[PDB]
A paper describes a structure:
In addition, we have solved the crystal structure of an APX triple mutant that has previously been shown to enhance Trp radical stabilization. Pea and soybean APX share 95% sequence identity with identical active sites so we used the soybean APX3M structure to model the mutations into pea APX. The main reason we solved the APX3M structure rather than simply model in the mutations is the uncertainty of how to position the Q204M mutant side chain. In APX, Gln204 extends out toward the surface while in CCP and LMP the Met points in toward the interior and helps to seal off the redox active Trp from solvent. Our initial computational studies showed that the results changed significantly depending on how Met204 is positioned which provided the motivation for solving the APX3M structure. While the addition of these Met residues into APX increases stability of the cationic Trp radical the effect is much less dramatic (rows 7, 10, 11).
Considerable experimental data indicate that the local electrostatic environment controls whether this Trp or the porphyrin is oxidized in Compound I. Attempts have been made to place the differences between these peroxidases on a quantitative basis using computational methods. APX, like HRP, has a cation bound about 8 Å from the active site Trp while CCP has no cation leading to the suggestion that the additional nearby positive charge destabilizes a cationic Trp radical.
Author numbering: 2 to 249
Amino acid sequence: GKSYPTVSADYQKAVEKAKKKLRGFIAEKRCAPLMLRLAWHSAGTFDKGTKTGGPFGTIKHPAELAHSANNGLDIAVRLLEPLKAEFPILSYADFYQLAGVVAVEVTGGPEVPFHPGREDKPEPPPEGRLPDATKGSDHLRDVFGKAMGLTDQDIVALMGGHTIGAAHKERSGFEGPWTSNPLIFDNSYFTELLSGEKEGLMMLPSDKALLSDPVFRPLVDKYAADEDAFFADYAEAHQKLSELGFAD
Ligand code: HEM
Ligand SMILES: [K+]
C-alpha cells in the first residue's frame, strides 16, 4: 500500500545527478559494502507498531552512530558529507537510501527501484533494534518480522547482502569476508553458506541459523541454485526495507 509523495522537478533532477555522482564516488572509494550497511542500519530501526525509526536521516546523528551495532558507520557518514553538500535540496534520508541502492548497482547487483520524498526526522530511535549476530531464527523473526514488518522471504534475501563486504575485529569483533569476491554482488553468500567453512571466509551464527530453519533453508537452497531468483527477491526486499514507514 505505497503512495509516493510529489517532489518538485528540481528535487528529481538532483536525485538523478546525485545517483550518477554516487556511482563514481562509491566505485572509486571501494566503499559499496559500507554504504549498503549504512542504508540498512538507517532503515532497520523501524518499528511498525509505533511507526518509529526507519530511513529518516537520523543515522547521521552522533547519538545513533554511537550505538554498538553501528560501530564503524561514522566512517560512511564522513565519506558522504562532501558529496551530500553538493545536493542541498535532497533530504539526508533520501541521500543515504540512494547510496545504498547505488552500492548494490555498482557492484553488479539488481537495480532496486527508488522513490524520493523521505523527510528527515529530528529524533533517533532508541538503541537495540538492530539484529544480534550471535542469535538465531527466533531473533531474526522478532527483528525483521515483529518490528520491521518484513516477510521470511525478505529476511533470507536481505541477508544475501553479505555477498559484499566483510567483518572487522575492531568494529563488530568478527573478522573476514563472507565470500571470495567481496566487491561483486552475486549469490555466493548462499553458495558458501551451503558448502561449509572455507579457510579465509567467515559466517556469523545468525547466517548459519538460516540453514536449520524449515522456512529459511528452502530459500537458501533456491538462491544458491538460481542467482536470477535471488536478484529478484533481493530487489523486492531492499525496496521494502528502504521504504519502511515511508509513503505508508
Ligand atoms: C539480519 C541479521 C544481520 C546481522 C546479525 C548482521 C551483522 C553484521 C555484522 C556483525 C557485520 C560486521 C560489521 C563489521 O565488523 O565491520 C556486518 C557487515 C555487513 N552487513 Fe550485515 N547483518 C545483518 C543483516 C544485513 C542486511 C539485511 C544487510 C543489507 C541488505 C547487511 C549488509 C552488510 C554489509 C554490506 C556488511 C559489510 C560492511 C563492510 O564491509 O564494511 N547485513 N553485518
Ligand atoms: K560476492
